[PDB]
Amino acid sequence: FQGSKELLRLQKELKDIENENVQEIDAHIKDSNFFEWVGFIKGPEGTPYEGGHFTLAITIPNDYPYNPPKIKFVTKIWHPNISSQTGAICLDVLKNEWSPALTIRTALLSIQALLSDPQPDDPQDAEVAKMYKENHALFVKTASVWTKTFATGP
Incomplete structure (x- = not known):
């Protein structure tokens, strides 16, 4: 528990995520760094991502919540808004929208929304x-x- 304002904030985010619907959106510490998480996003029903379980890498800056997390997929995925080779996504939107009011679960919910609703005009992977x-x-x-190949069960 006790420690910096950033540490308390991260601790709260994690407990809340733990308390929310972890079947949809989950995250925990990767290893031993509280500033590095692994995220889970459930592939949405009635999409080509259905039955998928997608792992992401979340690197949280040392001044959080005053700067946004960096997020990239780990699980390989075929989507116009995500590099089919590196899992990178365009986070320009949350970058300039970011404030202490936002949370990692909400960053992740909006990525899951992208899965449901791809945005082909703002593309990440040309192919x-x-x-x-x-x-x-x-x-x-x-x-x-x-x-069904890369995003199979836990």
């Missing part, structure tokens, strides 16, 4: 985005293969 636009029925199939 996935091309496919999403040019042959969408294939996109769905490719994203489904990758979910």
Whole structure:
């Protein structure tokens, strides 16, 4: 328990996440650094991500909550807004929206929203985005293969 304002804040976030719906969104400390978490996002029903369990890497800055976390997927995923090779996502939005009012679970909920509702005009992976636009029925199939291949159970 006792320690800095940042440490108390992180501790609260974790307990709350633990108290919320962890079937949807979860996070815990990776190893021994309170500033490095592993996140879980459930792939949303009725999407090509359905039945997927997606792991992310969350690096929390030392001045949190005054700066945003950095987040990237660990689990490989086929999505126009996520690098099919590195799991990187564009976080420009939360970057300039960030304030002490925001939380990591809400950062994660908004990424899960992206899974539900891909944004092809602001693309992260050129090849996935091309496919999403040019042959969408294939996109769905490719994203489904990758979910059932790379994002399998715990």
